[PDB]
Amino acid sequence: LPSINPHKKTIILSGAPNVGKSSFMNIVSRANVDVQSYNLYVGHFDHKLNKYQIIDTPGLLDRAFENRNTIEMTTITALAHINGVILFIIDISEQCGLTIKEQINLFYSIKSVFNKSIVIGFNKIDKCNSLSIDNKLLIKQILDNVKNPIKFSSFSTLTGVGVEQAKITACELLKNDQAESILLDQEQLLNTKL
Numbered sequence: 790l791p792s793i794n795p796h797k798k799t800i801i802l803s804g805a806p807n808v809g810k811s812s813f814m815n816i817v818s819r820a821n822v823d824v825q826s827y828n829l830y831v832g833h834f835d836h837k838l839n840k841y842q843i844i845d846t847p848g849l850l851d852r853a854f855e856n857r858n859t860i861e862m863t864t865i866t867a868l869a870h871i872n873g874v875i876l877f878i879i880d881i882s883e884q885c886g887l888t889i890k891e892q893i894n895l896f897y898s899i900k901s902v903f904n905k906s907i908v909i910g911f912n913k914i915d916k917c918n919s920l921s922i923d924n925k926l927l928i929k930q931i932l933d934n935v936k937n938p939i940k941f942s943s944f945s946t947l948t949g950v951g952v953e954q955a956k957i958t959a960c961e962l963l964k965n966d967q968a969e970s971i972l973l974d975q976e977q978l979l980n981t982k983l
């Protein structure tokens with residue numbers, strides 16, 4: 790809503806407070822970041838001759854929607870209608886102050902506003918690897934509960950390892966969705982004609 794181009798290819802960052810969202814944005818955009826107020830953050834980067842933005846909205850996409858007022862919801866909804874892929878980051882070290890299960894609960898609670906592609910980012914691997922079987926099966930359950938096309942990416946925004954890889958899989962998930970969706974529109978229009 791505040792000075793965002795809705796047509797530019799976008800990574801929409803989401804996840805609990807202190808999971809590494811602002812860190813991720815800063816790394817991939819080399820801090821080429823516009824600070825906009827309603828604070829909303831828009832990082833910019835190029836990948837493979839294409840221009841991208843990456844958006845971080847602390848206070849909006851880091852907590853459940855139950856407590857939002859109308860204006861906040863319209864802002865959230867406006868973001869959900871951008872040309873974007875979601876990067877939902879889970880801090881698997883739990884240093885953010887919430888357990889993996891509480892972070893997955895957050896994901897289910899808010900993934901309904903987005904049917905876009907989603908990358909689940911497992912961050913802070915410098916402080917982890919492995920996981921409880923209930924946690925691994927909770928993560929696996931995401932693939933069953935979710936109609937959205939979903940990929941996984943592990944990284945550390947403290948050490949840099951896997952970060953660029955995570956950025957690459959987000960972009961390509963977007964491409965594939967753009968490709969699949971334009972076909973459905975082309976098909977419906979011809980099926981109408983015929």
Ligand SMILES: Nc1nc2c(ncn2[C@@H]2O[C@H](COP(=O)(O)OP(=O)(O)O)[C@@H](O)[C@H]2O)c(=O)[nH]1
Nearest residue numbers: 806807808809810811812913915916945946947
């Ligand atoms: N151990 C570790 N700490 C991290 C990593 N990435 C970020 N942090 C720290 O986690 C805290 C929150 O990170 P931040 O980017 O502000 O998360 P955000 O609130 O979601 O935007 C900060 O103290 C960061 O320095 C990581 O990969 N590993």
